[PDB]
Structures are given as structure tokens and as C-alpha cells.
Swiss-Prot record, chain A:
This protein's record includes keyword Transmembrane: no
GO molecular function terms listed in the Swiss-Prot or TrEMBL record: ornithine decarboxylase inhibitor activity; small ribosomal subunit rRNA binding; structural constituent of ribosome
Species per Swiss-Prot/TrEMBL record: Escherichia coli (strain K12)
Quaternary state and interactors: Part of the 30S ribosomal subunit.
Keyword DNA repair: no
Family matches, as InterPro entries: Ribosomal_bS20, Ribosomal_bS20_sf
Highest taxon, organism lineage: Bacteria
Protein family according to the UniProt entry: Belongs to the bacterial ribosomal protein bS20 family.
Gene3D superfamilies: Ribosomal protein S20
Name of the molecule in the record: Small ribosomal subunit protein bS20
Function: Binds directly to 16S ribosomal RNA.
Disordered, as annotated region: 1-25
PANTHER family from the UniProt entry: 30S RIBOSOMAL PROTEIN S20, SMALL RIBOSOMAL SUBUNIT PROTEIN BS20C
UniProtKB/Swiss-Prot annotation, chain B:
Taxonomic superkingdom: Bacteria
Segment of the intact protein contained: 637 to 763 of 890
PTM note: A proteolyzed form, called IF2 gamma (begins with residue 290), can be detected during purification which has all the activities expected for this protein, although it is slightly less efficient than full-length protein. It is not clear if it exists in vivo.
Induction comment from the UniProt entry of this chain: Part of the metY operon that extends to pnp.
Organism: Escherichia coli (strain K12)
Name of the protein described by the UniProt record: Translation initiation factor IF-2
Similarity comment: family membership: Belongs to the TRAFAC class translation factor GTPase superfamily. Classic translation factor GTPase family. IF-2 subfamily.
Traits of the deletion mutant: Essential, it cannot be deleted. The C-terminal region (residues 165-890) is sufficient for growth at 42 degrees Celsius, although it grows more slowly at 37 degrees and is cold-sensitive at 30 degrees Celsius.
Subunit-level organization: Component of the 30S ribosomal translation pre-initiation complex which assembles on the 30S ribosome in the order IF-2 and IF-3, IF-1 and N-formylmethionyl-tRNA(fMet); mRNA recruitment can occur at any time during PIC assembly.
Curated annotation (Swiss-Prot), chain C:
Function: One of two assembly initiator proteins for the 30S subunit, it binds directly to 16S rRNA where it nucleates assembly of the body of the 30S subunit.
GO CC term (a single one): cytosol
GO molecular function: mRNA 5'-UTR binding; mRNA regulatory element binding translation repressor activity; rRNA binding; structural constituent of ribosome
Key words, A-Z: Antibiotic resistance, Repressor, Ribonucleoprotein, Ribosomal protein, Ribosome biogenesis, RNA-binding, rRNA-binding, Transcription, Transcription antitermination, Transcription regulation, Transcription termination, Translation regulation
Record-linked HAMAP family: Ribosomal_uS4_B
Family as reported in the entry's similarity comment: Belongs to the universal ribosomal protein uS4 family.
Organism from which the protein derives: Escherichia coli (strain K12)
Annotated InterPro entries: Ribosomal_uS4 (IPR022801), Ribosomal_uS4_bac-type (IPR005709), Ribosomal_uS4_CS (IPR018079), Ribosomal_uS4_N (IPR001912), S4_RNA-bd (IPR002942), S4_RNA-bd_sf (IPR036986)
Lineage, broadest ranks: Bacteria, Pseudomonadati, Pseudomonadota, Gammaproteobacteria, Enterobacterales
Gene: rpsD
SUPFAM superfamilies in UniProt: Alpha-L RNA-binding motif
An example Gene Ontology biological process: transcription antitermination
Name under which the protein is recorded: Small ribosomal subunit protein uS4
Curated annotation (Swiss-Prot), chain E:
Modification 3-methylthioaspartic acid occurs at: 88
GO MF terms held by the record: misfolded RNA binding; rRNA binding; structural constituent of ribosome; tRNA binding
Oligomeric and partner information: Part of the 30S ribosomal subunit. Contacts proteins S8 and S17. Interacts with ArfA. May interact with IF1 in the 30S initiation complex.
Modification type N6-acetyllysine: residues: 107
InterPro entries tied to this protein: NA-bd_OB-fold, Ribosomal_uS12, Ribosomal_uS12_bac
NCBIfam families named among the record's database cross-references: rpsL_bact (TIGR00981)
Protein name stated in the entry: Small ribosomal subunit protein uS12
GO terms of biological process kind: cytoplasmic translation; Group I intron splicing; maintenance of translational fidelity; positive regulation of RNA splicing; response to antibiotic; RNA folding; translation
Outcome following mutation: residue 56 to H: Protein is not incorporated into ribosomes
Species: Escherichia coli (strain K12)
GO annotations of cellular component type: cytoplasm; cytosol; cytosolic small ribosomal subunit; ribosome
Keyword Ribonucleoprotein: yes
Miscellaneous comment as given in the Swiss-Prot or TrEMBL entry: At least 19 substitutions or deletions in 11 codons can promote streptomycin resistance, dependence or pseudodependence; all but one of the streptomycin resistant mutations (K42R) are associated with hyperaccurate translation and thus reduced translational efficiency.
Amino acid sequence: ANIKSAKKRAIQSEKARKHNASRRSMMRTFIKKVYAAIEAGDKAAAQKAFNEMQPIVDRQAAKGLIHKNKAARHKANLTAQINKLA
Amino acid sequence: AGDEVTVVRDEKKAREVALYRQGKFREVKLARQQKSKLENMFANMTEGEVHEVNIVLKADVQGSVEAISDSLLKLSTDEVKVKIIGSGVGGITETDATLAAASNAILVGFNVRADASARKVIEAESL
Amino acid sequence: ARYLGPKLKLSRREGTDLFLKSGVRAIDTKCKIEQAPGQHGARKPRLSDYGVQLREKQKVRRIYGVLERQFRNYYKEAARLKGNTGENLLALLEGRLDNVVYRMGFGATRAEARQLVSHKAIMVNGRVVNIASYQVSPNDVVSIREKAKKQSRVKAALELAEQREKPTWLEVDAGKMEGTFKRKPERSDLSADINEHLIVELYSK
Amino acid sequence: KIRTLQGRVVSDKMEKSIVVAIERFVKHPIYGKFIKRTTKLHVHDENNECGIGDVVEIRECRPLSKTKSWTLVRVVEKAV
Amino acid sequence: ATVNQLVRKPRARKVAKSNVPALEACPQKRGVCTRVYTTTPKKPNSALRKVCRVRLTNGFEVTSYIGGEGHNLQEHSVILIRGGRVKDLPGVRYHTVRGALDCSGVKDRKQARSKYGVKRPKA
Amino acid sequence: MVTIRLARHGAKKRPFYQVVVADSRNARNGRFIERVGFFNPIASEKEEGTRLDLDRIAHWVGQGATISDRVAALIKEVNKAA
RNA sequence: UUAGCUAGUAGGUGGGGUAACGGCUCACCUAGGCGACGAUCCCUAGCUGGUCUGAGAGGAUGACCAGCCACACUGGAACUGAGACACGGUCCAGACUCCUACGGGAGGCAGCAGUGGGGAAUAUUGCACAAUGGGCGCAAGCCUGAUGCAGCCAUGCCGCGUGUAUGAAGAAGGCCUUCGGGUUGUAAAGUACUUUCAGCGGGGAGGAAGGGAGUAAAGUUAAUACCUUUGCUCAUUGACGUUACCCGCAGAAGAAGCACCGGCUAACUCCGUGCCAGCAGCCGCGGUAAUACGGAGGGUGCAAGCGUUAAUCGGAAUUACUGGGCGUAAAGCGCACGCAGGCGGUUUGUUAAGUCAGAUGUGAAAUCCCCGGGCUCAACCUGGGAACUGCAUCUGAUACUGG
């Protein structure tokens, strides 16, 4: 970049990018564990997995990695499905 | 290529003076044009030297175009007559390539590069 | 921006006295008043309808010292204004400062009055106005400023003025060299061999 | 506050949808003649109770599909 | 005639075709002199009228009049042309601007000088 | 945010300001929300020169609109005048 | 002189997805969806407020000002962030250019100046953050080619000047003349007189609000601290700037050109030329008297401009809705049947879409118009109004049209 701060911003945005990426990848992992339990038909594994997932979709919302509404749908959606089976 | 340069206090006062020098240089330009054509005092050339070659020259530097042309008129002969048309201050241009389009001529420069709009014309027609 | 050439030519072409000289002299002893200027002045113009309209407009313009652009703009304003356009044109002309200065007798001619104005010799309401076309309003007081008061042109100008018909709508004190534009002149105040409607016709076609 | 449209059913083929045509007269902007103009609307018909040719009362609602932003309020006249 | 008919096919004004297309809505154009010659005019006139063929900066090539008495123009003369037909010369739809670029003013003109590119004579 | 400020109209050497409520990001003479006064710094002061709809100014402040240094002055000046 | 178009296509279910509704996406299911009220395809184009023209209805148009959109070397992409798929950020690919010690690097003026190029043609590589406004900061302040200003160009609009008055047998010169005289022409010279503007000296508003030290009072608080608000005094802040404006000095002194004069069209004669040279918006001028060519004298129209060219509308009722035509002038298909379409006799009831009424909201500001205000006037700036003839919702009226 040409301007002093523009240079600095590219550096900061890359750091943030690697920070966000790391936390975001983690989060989707814990979401995916729940969908995987559901697809195997286990209430407990899927409830257990939902309980681990809950606090982290909530936290990443508070931290701006995602919006509150996204966290809610995930909880709403998974909760809907797990109940529909056991 | 060279001359006396003088600074002035205001530009507006120096505008009329600069335009005045153009008028004299233009008046003598048309004057020397009328003489050379009327000098023959006949509707054509008395003999068969009528065949001639035309050239088009644009040099990057102003000092050369006046200087080398004098040397370019030294190689001139009675049999074949060569004349310069539209000596340029630099580079090349649309109206210059057009100048060589009307009358067949070689387009040469002491130092020049082809413009983006210049390449299109030169590549299209045969030059 | 001003007509600077011979003046009696203009009177001679329009067929009338245009008051472009002081009036000290019978105009016929200064020029061949009843003959147009030029080689073919004796010739008569078998004059078209357009011709009579043109010459009438020229006449008025030449009386007041107005060139075409400003005069056309005067027509436009007369037209925009309420009431008869032809009469509105003459109100606007007659309200000009160079004109009013002339009518109070401060200048022997409108040309002389205009010079008085331009040369910062005239005040309006004790305020210096030096542009000829300044529109003067009811109750305004125009005066020769103190320093211009001893100019002999002005005394002579007031003498001649005293010998012209005296305009109704102006109150002039010759001693003070101040005067008051009481009201806009009516149509009836102004000469009756001006044909405004011809000028109005010229500018509507 | 119940803004509404009235029109007739030109197609009832789709599952839970219908095509409704709203026709009106309009003064011609230049030549003054009163001209028929038609507006076709894809409308929601949950339960598919609307038959072709029916005259139906419809209302505007949120997007229901790429082309449906209207739903059925009620049938007015049917089976002419 | 019918309202119905106009409602199906609106009134459609004819588009004006130009008399100086080579100008392409420019006030003048520049061009090189291709041929410089004379030509005779149409009934009932008779003369040797000066015209030139001119290739314009936009590619168009047109014939243009060289008004005035006398001119010093030849091939490769760069001139300025303006609109303006020559009536008894069919095909001729432009005039050359005397006293611009390579075109000189008319010699010795005193009246209407500005239409012939002639400076005001010291006097 | 929303701000109350002077949009400079009038002519060269003869400034004339239009007091306006607007999104602070829009250009000075550009999009505004509401016009609310004017300010002539060149008024003869024989008659008027500064006029403010103080009721609507306050309404906008009540909803968090900020106020120019120059409008904040005008308001104190006009409040003093009457 | 394009008639058919469409497989995420149209809809349904469910999962996923977004900040959010949604074929946004995926699977499955239904077979739809668009189209002669012009789809599809092709050409062109940023839209508006408004601008120009026109009595109007229209026609033409979308610089400058303001609103919306889109773009940022070309094609694609997402990252950061409340906001971007980023005008002076990132990544990939392309086109191109610059640096290099040859191994490798760097950049994107459709920001402001400026350059080359193209063109008939469009400006200075300027001053200042003093004012308004933006970013950051508690502030002081720093940054701001936004902006305020200055330079260039008669490009346009408006204003003013380039003098005023007097001046006759009315000179000389020029021009015409039947040689009597007419004209240029009160024009010039002479005589007084004025001094705007330009020149030169002298003085000198306003655009300045604030901010800074102190001080005092209130709200604070344990507190007279600090903080903040509001009064007081002191010293200060203007790029423009040699500002606007006012006074003084010198002398008419430094300031007039352009087109036209045959009819349309205001303005006429002589000499030169001789179907030549040439003019020409249209008619049409030129072969021996040419007011039409070219010069002259005279005149007409404009005037710091005047002409020519280009360009929109007007006049053009010459695309005719307002507002035309088709026997012989351009125009009735060679004739008939007929789908779509347009139109449809008469009565009642109903409906209330068309139509009509009222109410309400909206129709940005600027512009236009009206009455005022401010710059010496005007252009210009500005207060208030009126206007935006339009759209939409509700409630009515039911004669006419439609159901």
C-alpha cells in the first residue's frame, strides 16, 4: 500500500483474519458435531454436543465474529431437530 | 532552437507582443510561399525533373530539425528534388501520419516513439 | 458603450429635434434639420411598415442615450410589469438618473447630465450614485454634491432648464442644487409624438 | 387498514399458488382514449381453494417465493 | 386518423437529415488538401470556380470552396473548412476558412475583411 | 451523527449561511434533513440578519443532534437579543 | 427486415443460508412460469429535480447546482470492519510502465495542478486553512487540491468608460454634380469645461465566531481544588490584500471596432471589371449605365464586440392530442370472409373498476413566478409566498362507460 496507515491496516486486518479464522473454524467444528450426532440417531450424544456448542456460538456472537441472530438459529435449528427424534 | 528570451512583469501585457511576432513570421511565410511558386514564371517545369520525393520529419529536439534540414537540402539535386514537409517539435501524431497519408512519403525521426493512436493508423494503411 | 459621433445627424435622420444640444440655438441654424444625413438625404424614404417601427424605437433610444441591449432589457421589464407595456417602457426610461439629472436642469443635455453622474458629481439621498442607469424612486432627493456646486456648467444648465417647460413630478431648488423626484411621471406628462405601441409592436413579432 | 386487490384467476395449475389478473381502465396519456391494462400477480393459495375463472380478493404480504409477494384473502365469485 | 390508430401507431416526427455531415456537428474541421483545382458551374452561370478536395481529420473526404479573389493553396495544404454550400456547384457543401492554418487571407481586401481572413490595414 | 450547521450559500465575498440539520457525513452544501434557520454575517443590521427556529433546533438536540461551534454561538447570541 | 422464450426454469415440501423475506442454496415432488397489454433477441442509454424552446399542448435535452445509481487500468475474488466486495487496501490473472549491481523488485490522476496524444476547442505544476464543513484529540492543536480565494480565456450575463458644452457660409481634403451647388458636417480646428475608469500617492470597513491567560458566581464535592456553564477585564487570530469604499494629483489626456446597404430587410451613388474575376441564407446577380462582383464616398444596424460556422426549439396546422389529410394534388389494400381487438340499440335492478366529490398524507432543497430585503445600479445574493397542474389512502356520489 502507498499511505502509511494503509500499510498498517493491511497488517492489522491480516492478523484479525487469522484470529477470526481460527475461532470460526473451531466454532463450526462444534456445530458440525451436533449435526453428526443427529444423523446417527443419538439423543444423548446430540444433546451433549449441543450443550458444548451453546456457550461458544453465544460467545462468538458477543465477540462480533458472528451476529446474535446466527447464534440463535443454530440453537433453534439443532434444538428443533434433536427433539423431533428423542 | 535559439533566440533572445526576456521575462516580463505581467503575462497579459506580453500576450499581444507574442502574437505580434507570429503575425510577422506568418506574413513572411506566405510571402516566401508566393515567390517560390511564381518564380518559375510558367505553368510547369521546362524539363523532366518534375519527378520528386517527399519526406516527413519529426525530431524530439528543436535544434536538429532546423540544422539537419539545411544539410538535407545539400544532398538535393536538379534531377531529383527532395523537400521536407511539416517538421515536428517531437514524437509523432495523428495529423502527422495523416500528412504522410495524403502524399506518399517516408516518416522518419531523429528520436521518436509511436503513440497508441499513432500505431493504429500506421499499421492500417501502408506506410 | 456610448454613441460618441455627430449628434445632429441623429435628429436629422429621425426627422425631429432630439434635444442633443443645449437649446441655446434654433436647431435649423446649426444643421439642415429637415434633411437626412448623407449624399441622398434629399431622397424620400417610401418607408415600409417595419421601417416606421424601427425608426420610432431608434428615436426613443437616441433621446435617452440607450444602446440596444439595455433598451431591449427595458422592454422586457416593461412587459413583465403590470399595466400597459408601452407606458411602462417610458416610465423606466424616465426614471433613469442621467435622465432625472437632466430634467432638474443640472445638465444642458442628457449627455452632459450623464457625465455629471459618471464623474461623481451627483448624490441620491446624500449618497453618491455614479451609474447613469440608476433607477430613481418616488421621494428620492438627487443633488449636486458640494464640490460640484460651483461648476459653471450647472448654473447655465439651470438657466436653460428655467426656459424649458417645467416638469410636474420634480421639485427643484435651483439655489441648493437639490431636487425631489415626487412621483413617476404619468403618460400624459411625456411628449405625444412618441409612438410607444410601434416600439411594442417591433419587439413582439 | 386493509389494502386489497380484486381480479380473476387465469391459472390455478401450481401447487398452492395461483396467477391472478387485475384489469383496469386507464386514460391514454397522449390520445385520451381509455385503454384496458392488465396486471398479473403470482399469489399464494394455501389449500388451493381457488378455481380458474374465480373472482378473488387478494392482499400484499412479504415475499413467499422469487415471484410471490401476495396471498389470497378470500373467494368472491366462482364457476361462471 | 382514428384515435385507435394513433394509439397503435403514434405520430412520429421525421428526423432531419443534415447538409454538412462531414462536420459531424462540429463548427469547423481540419483536413489536408488532396486536389486543388477549378470547376465550372451550373445553368445559367459560367466561371472557373476554385475548389479543393480535402481529407478531413475524421476520414471523410469532401470538396470545399475556396472563396475570394486569389489563393495560394496546393496539395498537402492543411486547411480549415466550415459549413456552407456553393449553390451553382452541385456536390460542394463546405467552404474553406480563408486566413486559417495554411490558407492565406484574400489579398488587398478592404470591405468584409473578416470573411476573408484579412488583417486591418495600418492607416 | 446528526448535526446542526451552516451550509454556505450566497455569493463570492458575500457569504450567506443556511442553518441545516443533517447527517454529518454528507457534504456541507449537500443532502440535509431539515432547514432550521439562516445566518447573514453581512447583514446591515439595520434590519434582521439572523433567524433561528429554536423550537425545532431543540427538538433535534433532544434527539441527540450535535451543534456547530458557530451555530452554538448564534444560539447564544440570538438568546441574548431576545 | 427479431414471435416465440424458460431446467433453478415456475411453484411445493424439508435441510442449509443471510442482519433479514426469498430458488438465496440443495434434495425430493408437482409441471409449471413468461409472451402480441410485445416476451425473447438486436440497437442505443446512467435516471431525476430541472434546462432550452413553445401562448399552450408539445418538441429537444440531462454541463455547471442538488438527489439517487454505477464505476475506480481490464477480468475475477474475498479479507478486515457497524459499514466495502474498498477512488490514493489486499490476493490471483491480463494489458502496460518504471527501478536493478540481473539474482529480483515497484506502480495504476475518471482527486488538484501539470504532460503527451486526439481535437475546431476548454485554464496555473499558485495562496491559505482566516471563514464554513469533515477526520482525530479533554484540549491546545494537527490534517483537509473539501472549501475559501487568487491566475488564465470577451466564453456568457450585467454595469461603466473611450469625454461634456460651445463652435459656420458651413474651412482644407475626400465624394457626387446636370459646375449653379449638394455632402461628409457642429463633424474637425478653435473656445472654454469636466476627470468616472486606467495611472500615481494618501487613508481604511466587513467576512472574527472563537481560542488564550487571568478573574468572579453557580452546579460539584470533604473542600475555596479540578471539571463545566455563564458573565468581566487584558493581549491576540484575514489566504484573499496593493480588499470593498473614501480623499488627493496630472491632464482629454491611455481606451472603437465589426457586419451590412437588389427584394425578403433598416441603409445609394460613382469608378473598375465585362457570363471574366467574383457574389450567393432563399429568389438570383456578372457580355459596356452592375445600388447584387471589387474599391471608394455616403448611409444602415450592432458596439468591446461584430460577423461566419455548428447546434435545439420556434415560426412548421410541415406527424395535426389540443390541431390535417386520401375523386382529379402525396394517400382507399383488386375484392370478399373472418379470429384477436375497438365500438355497440332499449328497460330495470345490482355493483362501484372507469368517472366525479371531499378529507388526509406525500410531491426534498435549489430553479421558475409574485411581493419585499442587501451589494452605488444591474447582473448577483437573499426573506416569505404561490406553484409543483402528480401520486397514494380513506370516505362518499351513481348520470354516463365497464362488470
